[PDB]
Structures are given as C-alpha cells and as structure tokens.
Amino acid sequence: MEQVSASIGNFTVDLFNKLNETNRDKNIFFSPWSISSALALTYLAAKGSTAREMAEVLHFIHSGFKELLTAFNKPRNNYSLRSANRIYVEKTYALLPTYLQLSKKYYKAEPQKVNFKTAPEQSRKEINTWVEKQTESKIKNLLSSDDVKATTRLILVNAIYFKAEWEVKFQAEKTSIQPFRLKNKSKPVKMMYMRDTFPVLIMEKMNFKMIELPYVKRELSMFILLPDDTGLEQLERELTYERLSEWADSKMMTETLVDLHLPKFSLEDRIDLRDTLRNMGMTTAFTTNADFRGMTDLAISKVIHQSFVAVDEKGTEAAAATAVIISFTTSVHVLKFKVDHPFHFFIRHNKSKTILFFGRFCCPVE
Numbered sequence: 001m002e003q004v005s006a007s008i009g010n011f012t013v014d015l016f017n018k019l020n021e022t023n024r025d026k027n028i029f030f031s032p033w034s035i036s037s038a039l040a041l042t043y044l045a046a047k048g049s050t051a052r053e054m055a056e057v058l059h060f061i062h063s064g065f066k067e068l069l070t071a072f073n074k075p076r077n078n079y080s081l082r083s084a085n086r087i088y089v090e091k092t093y094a095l096l097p098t099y100l101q102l103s104k105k106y107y108k109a110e111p112q113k114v115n116f117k118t119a120p121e122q123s124r125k126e127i128n129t130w131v132e133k134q135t136e137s138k139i140k141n142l143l144s145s146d147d148v149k150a151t152t153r154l155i156l157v158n159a160i161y162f163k164a165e166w167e168v169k170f171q172a173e174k175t176s177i178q179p180f181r182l183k184n185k186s187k188p189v190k191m192m193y194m195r196d197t198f199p200v201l202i203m204e205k206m207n208f209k210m211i212e213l214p215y216v217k218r219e220l221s222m223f224i225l226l227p228d229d230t231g232l233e234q235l236e237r238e239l240t241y242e243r244l245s246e247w248a249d250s251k252m253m254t255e256t257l258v259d260l261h262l263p264k265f266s267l268e269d270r271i272d273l274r275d276t277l278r279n280m281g282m283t284t285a286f287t288t289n290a291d292f293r294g295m296t297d298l299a300i301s302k303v304i305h306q307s308f309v310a311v312d313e314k315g316t317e318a319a320a321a322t323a324v325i326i327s328f329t330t331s332v333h334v335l336k337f338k339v340d341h342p343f344h345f346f347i348r349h350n351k352s353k354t355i356l357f358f359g360r361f362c363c364p365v366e
Contacts, residue, residue: 003061013240020360027360030358032357032358033160034085039057040058041085042154044107045295047294053285065106082160084130084135084157085107090153120148142159164315170193177191182230195257198258222345231341259334260338261337262311263361272304286301344360
C-alpha cells in the first residue's frame, strides 16, 4: 500500500506540471488517483515496451490497487468515493481470460466488448450512460459524437464522483462577498469563514503556510498550500511529492487557533489525456503496434477522464441538513489564514497518504 501511494504521488506532481505547461494561466484540477487506477487496467494488459513506458509514466506489486480500492470503496464510511473506470473494445477483438480473471480480481471491473464497427454513435450512448450510472448521475455526456467513431478501437474512460461533509461545517450566515486578489487584478467571491483549530504549517523558508482542513472523522482531508503573499510560480517549482509528504506528515505541522477565510469555490474538469500521456512518455500504447497482448491477440484510441469538486460550507457535493447550529463565541491570539489569493489544494486519504484530487486555484475568471 505504501509503495503505490508514492507512485501516484509522483505521477500526480508530474501530470500536474505537464498540464500546467500548456495552461500556465488556467486552474488545474484532476484525480491523480482516478487516472493511475484507470491506467493500471490497460497496464495490466500492456506487455513488452508498451509497459516499460507506461510504468515509467505512472511511476511503477499490483495488489496495491486492490488493497486501496477496497479501503476506499469498502467502507471508510463518512465519504463517498464512487468512481467509474472501464475498458471498451470492439465486439471484434479477442479477450484472453487471464486478463479478465485479473481485472475482476483486483479491479472489480470487467472490460466490456462493444460494437464500434457499425454502432459508434450508439456504443457511445451506452458508455456515457454507464458513466452516468456509476457517478450518481453527476457526470453527463462524457463522450462527444467526435469521441466515438468506427475508427475507434479501445476506449478507456475514467471518471469519479465524490462526497464528503467537512468535519466542522462553516456557517452560511458568515459567508460574505469578498475580493479574491489576483497588484492589478481582482474579482469577488463568496468567502466562507470560521475560527477554529487546524493543523497548520508555517515556514518563511519557502515563504508559504499550510493548513489541513479535515473531512469527517479526519479520514480524508483537504490541504491548502497558500503562498504567504499569481505568486504561485515559485512555490510550484519547488513542488515535489517528497516535500509534500515530508510536510503534511511533518511533525512540524501543528494545531493552531485560526481565523479561516476559504473561498466557497468550485472546479470541474474533463481531460482527453491522449496528447498529455503521449508527451509524458506514453506513446506506443496508441500506435497500432501496441503490445496489449496482455488482453488481446489494437491500441488505446482515447482516454477520457473527468473529475470535479465544489468546496462549500459542507466540503463538497454534500447531502446536507445541519439542523441544529449552536456556536459559542467565547473569549480571548489568531493565525490569520486568509485564503484570498492563488493557492494549491489537494485532498488525501490521510490513512494511506493517497492523493485523490489535486489542484491549483487562481482564477474565478468566468
């Protein structure tokens, strides 16, 4: 379990940087966990050189997913981590059982053979529906008429739902419309607020403070690396999975009374990873000369991923009802932790340190 989590950990920072390079000016967001996991599948069918490269990319033993997969989906109640990763091939291609035995074994998921050959526009609907069913109906039409063709061969789709009430919800009566500073730009945002205790990590060394806003029973938590004063460029350079792990896990990050200002925000992203992965070192799995002989005797033609998040006075897409609210403002110093400028933020399964979501917020720009 502690070997895979590092893999993701790295794959994450990398995937991030890449995505960044293109959009040095966008809000980056994705589920590193929902991608390695989904890419693991094909991988568990990628032999020879197609693998040697995939391994390099995802940073690669195999039970690390079964072990984490249940951990999360099994109960680890108090947060819902519904995900949908599958492999759709044409009715024509041939599946070599061992693969089925294994996918079913670790990934409680079976590759579905579909008819792309003469029911492209239909197969699609079928897919976009499975997604819809597996995500609690929050992810609509994942694939577009342009994403499914008769030329299509292997489509790996990977989405993921996610609900979690914060541990200690904010009071809406306190959310005021403040300005999210971007020295020349600035726009407004419903800025949540509360005074409480959170593990914080300060350090003038790299000029940035870190806070851990824990979800229920602190199973999963959100971490916000906020640069003392996009202003993020320097902090993202120093960014490593090493430094992140030494930090969040650091015995130097401790509970502190804090006046918290957290922009009630929201991000959703869809990513056609083909170009991205090709560029990161995964190339051969897309040529017709793919060594996917692990499952058949064909190449990935697409990979559509799609995650989202919506921080609010409850955490994320939460079924709420905070019936009884009874705060006791009582009396008498504070670490003002105002999150009113570009920041980094990720969500983790603290137990296992697996980063599930990761992102950068810096643009309310509509």
